[PDB]
Design an enzyme around this catalytic site. Structure first.
Site, PDB file in Angstrom:
ATOM      1  N   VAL A 141       0.838  -1.202   0.000  1.00 32.84           N
ATOM      2  CA  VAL A 141       0.000   0.000   0.000  1.00 32.84           C
ATOM      3  C   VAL A 141       0.873   1.252   0.000  1.00 32.84           C
ATOM      4  CG1 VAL A 141      -1.828   1.249   1.152  1.00 32.84           C
ATOM      5  CG2 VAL A 141      -1.820  -1.260   1.177  1.00 32.84           C
ATOM      6  N   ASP A 142       1.843   1.304   0.913  1.00 27.44           N
ATOM      7  CA  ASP A 142       2.684   2.495   1.050  1.00 27.44           C
ATOM      8  C   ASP A 142       3.834   2.567   0.049  1.00 27.44           C
ATOM      9  OD1 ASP A 142       1.059   3.313   3.100  1.00 27.44           O
ATOM     10  OD2 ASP A 142       2.453   2.732   4.699  1.00 27.44           O
TER      11      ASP A 142
END
Lengths: 134, 57, 77
Positions: free
Chosen positions: C58-59
């Site tokens: 996600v990051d």
């Protein structure tokens, strides 16, 4: 693996350890696995695939009932269930003949509420009789 | 109750409320439980089969 | 001159879009994580382990966006 118990008001259909199973449900068919997420549900007219040790399946008709998965040992309760070679293709074809007559012979809503169940019984049999050939 | 071909025992036991003082299945525990929708109907009909079975047996 | 006035704007838009993306993505993913516990708690640690495993990907991109926003704001200026 895990232990499966299948019973009806008339007889015990099966009892013993099994490798995996595929079972009918209320919305749709579901496959169970060892240590699966615990659940309980009613089942629509259908059948269950019993794949035991060494990979040998057998096919049990489940015209109506409830399935239980809370423990590792699972459980099927059947309002009506028939062992896969007590029934036969000729019997499911007779059910087909019956249901195709009653579809033509049902004309209101309540009697169609009964003829639809008669059709569902016939169709579930016509399904398991084909699965039985494997 | 038919405990022997030539001996039988009179018995009384409770159906409702379904006794939770039975031994707890602490072994079977989980990280996810799924109830199929309309759980009230499924549970109610299931318990009706339970009482049906116990009385008839 | 005009260069710095536009470069602060560029870094602002980049980091703002990065913030929206990262925050909502982890919001959804952690929402499913917190749902699992409400079903039953005994895999809170293991679902939290898979949670970090996924939250890394996600990051992944938003921190490229943040790194280049910081670079533009402090190094191109």
């Amino acid at each position: 693996t895990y232990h499966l118990d299948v019973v009806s008001a008339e007889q015990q259909m099966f009892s013993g350890l099994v490798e995996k199973i595929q079972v009918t449900g209320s919305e749709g068919e579901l496959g169970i696995y060892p240590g699966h997420a615990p659940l309980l549900t009613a089942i629509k007219p259908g059948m269950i695939r019993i794949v035991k040790q060494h990979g040998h399946e057998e096919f049990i008709y489940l015209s109506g009932g409830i399935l239980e998965v809370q423990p590792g040992n699972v459980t099927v309760l059947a309002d009506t269930a028939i062992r896969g070679q007590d029934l036969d293709e000729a019997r499911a074809m007779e059910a087909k003949r019956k249901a195709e007559e009653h579809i033509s012979s049902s004309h209101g809503d309540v009697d169609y509420a009964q003829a639809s169940a008669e059709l569902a019984k016939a169709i579930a049999q016509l399904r398991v009789i084909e699965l039985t050939k494997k | 109750k038919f405990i022997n071909t030539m001996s039988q025992v009179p018995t009384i036991s409770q159906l409702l409320p379904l006794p939770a003082s039975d031994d707890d299945d602490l072994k079977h525990k989980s990280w996810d439980y799924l109830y199929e929708p309309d759980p009230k109907a499924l549970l109610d009909t299931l318990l009706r089969r339970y009482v049906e079975s116990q009385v008839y047996q | 001159n005009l260069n710095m006035d536009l470069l602060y704007m560029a870094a602002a838009v980049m980091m703002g879009l990065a913030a929206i993306g990262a925050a909502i993505g982890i919001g959804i993913l952690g929402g499913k994580f917190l749902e699992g516990a409400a079903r039953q708690p005994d895999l809170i640690p293991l679902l939290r382990t898979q949670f970090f495993i996924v939250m890394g990907l996600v990051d992944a991109i938003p921190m490229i966006a943040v790194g280049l926003g910081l670079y533009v704001m402090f190094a191109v200026a």
